Design a protein around this ligand. Structure first.
Ligand SMILES: [Zn+2]
Ligand SMILES: [Zn+2]
Length: 401
């Protein structure tokens, strides 16, 4: 009677669903969960089948910028009225607020989150003559020079594909660029924004970035790092554990380090939420399922198995204490432990730089497109800024007259 969709969920996290949905099913025999999985490659296939059956999920996972986009078309329920009293106080406030669309309300409930680190290939680093690894975007151009010229490998990968990861968009925010103002108008036509556009335009033209950044998404950065062809990757403990079995030695060479952060030192948080579509006649039961999946006990389980961080304050403090007591023996276990502590301790100064803001996902595709043209030599960086501003304000003028 309850439809649960997990969108683009790694198949490694599958045995957990059977363990939690097992708990829910014995706890609620009269409201069993029909789990539908939509991993990469079968998303279009599955969604379209659901369109042709006029069926929708009661609970589904989304990232904040994506939820706000779907909330703009009236597809998500505002949960503030369906929540029991005291629920919001179980979650990290900064994270709970990030799942709040300023124009639609609480459209989702926080689930797990990940503070991605800088996984540094210490081998390529020494091949280039370096001892430290960069920690502020200012230090990146020179680092990218050393790696590329003195070792023939690329120093970093950040996609510029309009519809993929926002890591690049996040870097703008870290470098002090404000994307939208109060009236939902463009706010990046500023000295800080022109520096950001040029920063990436220059890195690509200079040849210090892989040519594929404009044609392939962040999944190629993971392929390149596994191949020993990338010096730095933005990820964390769970991926690091996959390397220890797939392509080890690249793991024996990797060391987790604090993430590339702006001059204000705030790293990024990647938030996964749960939302309840408005076309649901069990919205109250759906919210009960979402609050169950995201309670302290289940979050603490998941944070361990998936090596992520929970949004529950209770589970968070439990994970921390479970790490401060951890005393590993293998140097691999200490590598994984070192990464989870880094993300945990970095969480204090970390924020969701791209929250559930309406139009921001659309703005991302506008910025990446004109940025592509800039780094491909068609236009300038200062010209890409203006063209992106004009093109966005043209849209905002009709969406928010
Ligand atoms: Zn509200
Ligand atoms: Zn991607």
């Amino acid at each position: 009677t309850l439809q649960l969709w997990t969108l683009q969920l790694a198949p490694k996290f599958n045995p957990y669903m059977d363990d939690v949905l097992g708990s829910w099913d014995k706890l609620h025999p009269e409201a069993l969960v029909r789990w539908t999985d939509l991993p990469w490659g079968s998303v279009e296939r599955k969604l379209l089948a659901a369109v042709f059956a006029r069926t929708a999920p009661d609970v589904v996972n989304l990232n904040p910028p994506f939820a706000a986009n779907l909330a703009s078309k009236g597809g998500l329920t505002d949960l503030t009225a369906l929540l029991p009293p005291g629920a919001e106080q179980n979650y990290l406030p900064s994270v709970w607020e990030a799942a709040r669309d300023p124009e639609a309300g609480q459209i989702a409930i926080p689930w797990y989150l990940t503070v991605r680190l800088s996984l540094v290939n210490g081998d390529l680093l020494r091949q280039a003559g370096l001892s430290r690894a960069p920690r502020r975007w200012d230090e990146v151009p020179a680092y990218a020079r050393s790696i590329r010229e003195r070792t023939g490998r690329y120093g970093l990968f950040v996609t510029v594909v309009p519809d993929d990861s926002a890591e690049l968009l996040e870097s703008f925010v870290q470098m002090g660029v404000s994307l939208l103002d109060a009236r939902q108008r463009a706010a990046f036509n500023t000295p800080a924004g022109r520096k950001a556009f040029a920063f990436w335009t220059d890195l690509y033209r200079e040849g210090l970035l892989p040519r594929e950044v404009v044609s392939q998404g962040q999944r190629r950065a993971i392929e390149l790092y596994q191949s020993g062809e990338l010096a730095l990757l933005a990820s964390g403990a769970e991926f690091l554990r996959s390397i220890q079995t797939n392509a080890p030695g690249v793991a024996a060479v990797t060391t987790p380090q604090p993430p590339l952060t702006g001059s204000d030192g705030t790293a990024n948080v990647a938030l996964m939420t749960l939302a309840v579509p408005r076309q649901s006649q069990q919205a109250g039961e759906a919210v009960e399922l979402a609050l169950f999946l995201t309670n302290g006990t289940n979050q603490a389980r998941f944070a361990r198995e998936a090596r992520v961080l929970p949004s529950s304050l209770e589970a968070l403090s439990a994970i921390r204490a479970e790490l401060e007591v951890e005393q590993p023996s293998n140097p691999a276990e200490a590598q994984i432990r070192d990464a989870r502590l880094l993300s945990a301790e970095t969480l204090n100064t970390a924020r969701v730089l791209v929250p559930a803001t309406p139009g921001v996902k659309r703005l991302q595709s506008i910025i990446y497109t004109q940025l592509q043209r800039a780094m491909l030599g068609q236009i300038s960086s200062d010209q890409a800024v203006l063209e992106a501003e004009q093109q966005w304000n043209r849209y905002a003028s009709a969406r928010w007259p």
